[PDB]
């Protein structure tokens, strides 16, 4: 059993891989609030996500190298998925390019950031 997550903040979409989601699920079993840092390999950018106990994301921000804020986003939508299929169906309907749908479909494992088209 796994849980996939997709977060739309500003006009960007953020894909959260299952393994990370399970780590947050365990952390929130033991605490009330979680601040997770996510590394975007492709663009070499770092982002800090704040989750409540209900696993919605409260705030999204772009971080520097000393956990510093460069840009703040407004969370618009948070969506959860029980299997890869429902994730793929959402991706195909996402307002992204085929090159972005190709990336999200092949890399469930990594923190991925794509832009709205």
């Amino acid at each position, epitope marked *: 059993s796994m849980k996939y997550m997709l977060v739309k903040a500003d006009d960007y979409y953020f894909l959260l891989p299952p393994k990370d989601v399970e780590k947050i699920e365990s952390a929130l079993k033991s605490t009330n609030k979680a601040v997770v840092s996510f590394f975007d390999k492709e663009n070499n950018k770092t982002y800090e996500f704040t989750f409540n106990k209900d696993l919605v994301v409260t705030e999204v921000r772009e971080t520097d190298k000393n956990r510093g804020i460069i840009k703040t986003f407004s969370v618009k939508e948070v969506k959860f998925f029980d299997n890869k299929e429902e994730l793929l169906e959402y991706i195909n309907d996402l307002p992204i390019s085929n*090159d972005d749908k190709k990336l999200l*479909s092949n890399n469930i494992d990594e923190f991925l950031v794509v832009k709205a088209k």
Partner: antibody
Amino acid sequence: QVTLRESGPALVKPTQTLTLTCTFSGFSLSTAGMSVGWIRQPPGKALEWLADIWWDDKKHYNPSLKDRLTISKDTSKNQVVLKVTNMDPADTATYYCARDMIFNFYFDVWGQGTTVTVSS
Amino acid sequence: DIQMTQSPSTLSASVGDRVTITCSASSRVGYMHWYQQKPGKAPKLLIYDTSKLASGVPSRFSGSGSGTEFTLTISSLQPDDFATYYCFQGSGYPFTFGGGTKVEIKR
């Protein structure tokens, strides 16, 4: 392996409607990411993509064959149907169906193609 | 709409030569895809995602490129390599092919 075979008439009177049928095997158009598309090639000319359908029932068409293309799928029959209205001699070509995937926006496997001539 | 100019239109090379074909796109494209069509037969995927060999295609074939300039290469040209080659993009609808490149063997 994955096999795709196209079937349809070899002769179509002008202004009539061409109906092609792609019967595939080795995959399901119900599996997520899976897609099937149609591509044609007039005698001695370059390939032109025509249409495609996806597992989510999303359909895309070449804006050049406007108001003339319609595609559907029957996952039980494992086949895809393409309908082209108002057939014309410029549409005489070999018609090919092929598989696509959201994972790879390219046609990895093709059918043998069916030749269709528009003539009175 | 992404249009694609393939070059040369025709090419004659001896067996063992190194053949290079170029695809120039009308706009930036993430990946280029190459097909080989012998005459009367259906296209066969040769190189995918710009530089990836399809399964069962000889190592003699390779691809390179980025943005709007892409290339397909044959290290040692073999007699069976007679065909027309097509660069294809799936990065944006409508999907479009190149004009094709006819590769003839000189003997």
